[PDB]
Design a protein around this ligand. Structure first.
Ligand code: EQL
Ligand code: EQL
Ligand code: ZN
Ligand code: ZN
Lengths: 340, 322
């Protein structure tokens, strides 16, 4: 049944915009770099987090905080407090703690006064992880502020990134030498000054260099279907999320959940021969089945923070998971009509 | 036979089972000079037989450089610039390796047993080499080189080319700098298979590294044997390493390097090296139009001598390995 899938992959392919986004983010950086607190700001990598939203872009603004002290908040292995006029963030302390609210409030207010200078009509949507702009009433851009630390990764990541049997232990050591990032994200009436660990840069490298063989998808003999499986998994969720848009059931589910499950499947199937392009229908069925397992199990560990469960009941209602399960199982049983 | 090569590699590792942070003190006192403030390590032993001799590259970044090729020696270049800490060393618009080495050879003795690769410290021994670092894009002579696309992938080829390249003081004309990629060579060797997990599990154990070790040991032993003769004087472990890289391009798949076939793979490396001698062609792996085996560089009689000696060794189960 791969014919209906690659039909979807061809239709999704013809979304082949950025430039009006580039000019806005470039103008935003030029002004943001004039502030002492945001002097070292810069782009991380335009990224299409949603596969079926060509008018939705996503950028990450990085800003290094040299020599910080991360204090874990109440054993939530992903949320941390940030500790440290030698610090240019001196206007944002709430004691010894970097205030995420104040740091975000100024970041938001600078962009507000900066989208008005532009020729091009830009609107900031109303109000964490941070600001969304509306370029010319058609294209929306989500900007996320990310603290950068070039220090070694927190101890909660020690057992994560289990890519040794797939991308090798040597690659795993190399990626862990790269910096990590912290995004302002409240934690569960919420601790409003916490930051969540972020490895979006590592996730990019893993996706765009994804085979056991270094030449995977570089010749016809080693062409795998890893990327297509993730694309279809994202399209499925987006279609269902939009189909049941005003039932609120699928609100808390996002492409990161689907992307996390896909990484775990990559660990369980480390050989390129398990992802042969002629097996797209089977491979996709196994990806859908595994995601369904995480739903029924209420266990989807963060790929980098294994003790952080993305599908715990404290984060996502069991009813919402049961609803996602029923919808996905109906689709898979009936050859995915939501793709049409 | 094949058991003789495994025995040699076995003795080579006992030879290295049992090193000096002296160099860390050198860069302490060397970084305090104005012209050498951007100094540091780059990463080794060329002589695999005697591990009592080390080799270091002292990297020094040279920001605004424009390279001009010297009479189409696609490896050698004059370094000019486009406040300047090395203003002491200019001989006009070009940068003098003579005065830089002299000042570099002045503080090695000042802040010190030096020996006038620029210097040699006797502790053990370490060959210190001065290298200019350039973060610019590689010269046009490297365009058709690093042919690793069918082996380590085109993607990897693009990542390594973004890394800086280096220039060492090398005679050709006496103020020329030769291209150096000892850092890329290091990565290519310590990350050598088509599979990223090559040599990380018994199922994917290749013999690439051992074929290079035996090739280096074969040349070093023959060079010692005929030391009183001058035939093998200009052959070096870098020639052996370069030939091994081209053999890797020729045999990209890991299945062509199964450690069960050490004898077959090693004979492949010998055969190709032999072919480079008879035809007098051994291109630099990064600079293809630079032939390390040209008749201008090495005597044909010298090549034919090494050819006949290695041919004797291969025909008698390599008694050089006893
Ligand atoms: O789509 C999102 O909101 C989202 C984006 C990125 C990330 C996450 C994470 C957890 C939950 C969500 C979410 O709330 O869905 C999410 C996470 O642990 N690491 C991320 O990098
Ligand atoms: O062993 C050496 O002398 C040596 C070391 C390193 C290099 C070279 C090169 C050419 C010739 C020799 C040599 O003359 O043998 C050599 C070269 O093109 N690139 C090198 O990186
Ligand atoms: Zn692939
Ligand atoms: Zn190997």
């Amino acid at each position: 049944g791969a014919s209906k899938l690659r039909a979807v992959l061809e239709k999704l392919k013809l979304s082949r915009a950025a430039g009006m986004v580039k000019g806005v983010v470039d103008h935003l950086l030029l002004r943001l770099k004039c502030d002492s607190a945001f002097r070292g700001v810069g782009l991380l990598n335009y990224e299409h987090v949603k596969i079926s939203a060509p008018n939705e872009f996503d950028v990450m603004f990085k800003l290094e905080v040299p020599r910080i002290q991360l204090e874990e908040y109440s054993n939530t292995r992903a949320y941390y407090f940030v500790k440290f006029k030698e610090n240019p963030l001196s206007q944002f302390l709430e004691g010894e703690i970097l205030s995420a609210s104040k740091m975000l409030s100024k970041f938001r207010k600078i962009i507000k006064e900066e989208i008005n200078d532009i020729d091009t009509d830009v609107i900031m949507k109303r109000k964490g992880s941070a600001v969304t702009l509306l370029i010319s009433e058609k294209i929306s851009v989500d900007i996320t502020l990310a603290l950068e630390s070039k220090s070694s990764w927190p101890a909660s990541t020690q057992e994560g990134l289990r890519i040794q049997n797939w991308l090798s232990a040597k690659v795993r050591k190399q990626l862990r030498l790269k910096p990590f990032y912290l995004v302002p994200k409240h934690a569960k009436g919420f601790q409003e000054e916490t930051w969540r660990l972020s490895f979006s840069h590592i996730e990019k490298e893993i996706l765009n260099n994804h085979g056991k063989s270094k030449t995977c998808c570089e010749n016809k003999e080693e062409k795998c279907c890893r990327k297509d499986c993730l694309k279809l998994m994202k399209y499925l969720l987006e279609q269902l999320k939009e189909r049941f848009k005003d039932k609120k059931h699928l609100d808390k589910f996002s492409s990161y959940h689907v992307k996390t499950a896909f990484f775990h499947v990559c660990t369980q199937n480390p050989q390129d021969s398990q992802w042969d392009r002629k097996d797209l229908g089977l491979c996709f069925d196994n990806c859908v089945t595994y995601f369904l397992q995480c739903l029924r199990t209420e266990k989807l560990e963060n790929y980098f923070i294994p003790e952080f469960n993305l599908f715990s009941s404290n984060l996502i209602d069991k009813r919402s998971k049961e609803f996602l399960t029923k919808q996905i199982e109906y689709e898979r049983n009936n050859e995915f009509p939501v793709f049409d």
